[PDB]
Curated annotation (Swiss-Prot):
One of its GO terms (cellular component) is extracellular space. It comes from Bos taurus (Bovine). Keywords: Calcium, Digestion, Disulfide bond, Hydrolase, Metal-binding, Protease, Secreted, Serine protease, Signal, Zymogen. Residues 1-221 form the Peptidase S1 domain. CDD domains: Tryp_SPc. Its main location: secreted. It catalyses: Preferential cleavage: Arg-|-Xaa, Lys-|-Xaa. It is found in: Secreted, Extracellular space. This is Serine protease 1.
Length: 223
């Protein structure tokens, strides 16, 4: 997260760290046994880490659960990143409390101008790598589709939305992928891609979760 602030331990209780021996992606807890992340975060050997704050120290509140299966969206395209969403089922259910809680799925999509909270342990520099130990937060607004499409002409599908600052300086970055974009208490986006990080006129692009709620519910209902 570039230009963000320290969230504070356990203030984002649905945030998970996808770990394969190091933090590689973010994710969101949607019920005690399922996590939602981005399809480009897929790999086998995924341990889901809940209740985290400093990902390098065990401080208490952490629950490490192995993924029983990951379900990448069948229409995911790794060249365009269209349908960049993945569901991970956990081997065992997490104990939900105040530090580990699920986030609700939206009933409607969000509008441009909606302010959302993006969080993650991804890079904090737009030039070079500085990964933090604790979770960073950034409040960013969803942008209008016309500004999004003028920024990435021909690269935005109806399953993507832009959120961020066109003047540059604040954005999500590498390491943040798969994590949550929460607006008004509802999961509206999944960190997906961007051109560099916090560069002017290059806002972050996110998976538009409101287009997948029936797919998520139908898939969880059958697995
Ligand atoms: C270069 O290697 C990788 C590998 C996986 C990623 O998700 C990313 C990545 N770049 C990203 C850029 C952004 C952004 N909003 N500017 C957000 C997530 C990203 N994730 C980069
Ligand atoms: Ca920790």
């Amino acid at each position: 997260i570039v230009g963000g602030y320290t969230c504070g331990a356990n203030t984002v209780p649905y945030q998970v760290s996808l770990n394969s021996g190091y933090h590689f992606c973010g994710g969101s807890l949607i019920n005690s046994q399922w996590v939602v992340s981005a399809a480009h975060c897929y790999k086998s050997g995924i341990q889901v880490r809940l209740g985290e704050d400093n990902i390098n120290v065990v401080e208490g509140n952490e629950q490490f659960i192995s993924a029983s299966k990951s379900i990448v969206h069948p229409s995911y395209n790794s060249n365009t990143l269209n349908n960049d969403i993945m569901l991970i089922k956990l081997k065992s259910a997490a104990s939900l409390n105040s530090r580990v809680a699920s986030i609700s799925l939206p009933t409607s999509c969000a509008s441009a101008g909606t302010q959302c909270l993006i969080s993650g342990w991804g890079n904090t520099k737009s030039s070079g790598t500085s990964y933090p130990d604790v979770l960073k937060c950034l409040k960013a607004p969803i942008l209008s589709d016309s500004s999004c499409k003028s920024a990435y002409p021909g690269q935005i599908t109806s399953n993507m939305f832009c959120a961020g600052y066109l003047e540059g300086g604040k954005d999500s970055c590498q390491g943040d992928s798969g994590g949550p974009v929460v607006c008004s208490g509802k999961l509206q986006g999944i960190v997906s891609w961007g051109s560099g990080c916090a560069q002017k006129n290059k806002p972050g692009v996110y998976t538009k979760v409101c287009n997948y709620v029936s797919w998520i519910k139908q898939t969880i209902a059958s697995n």
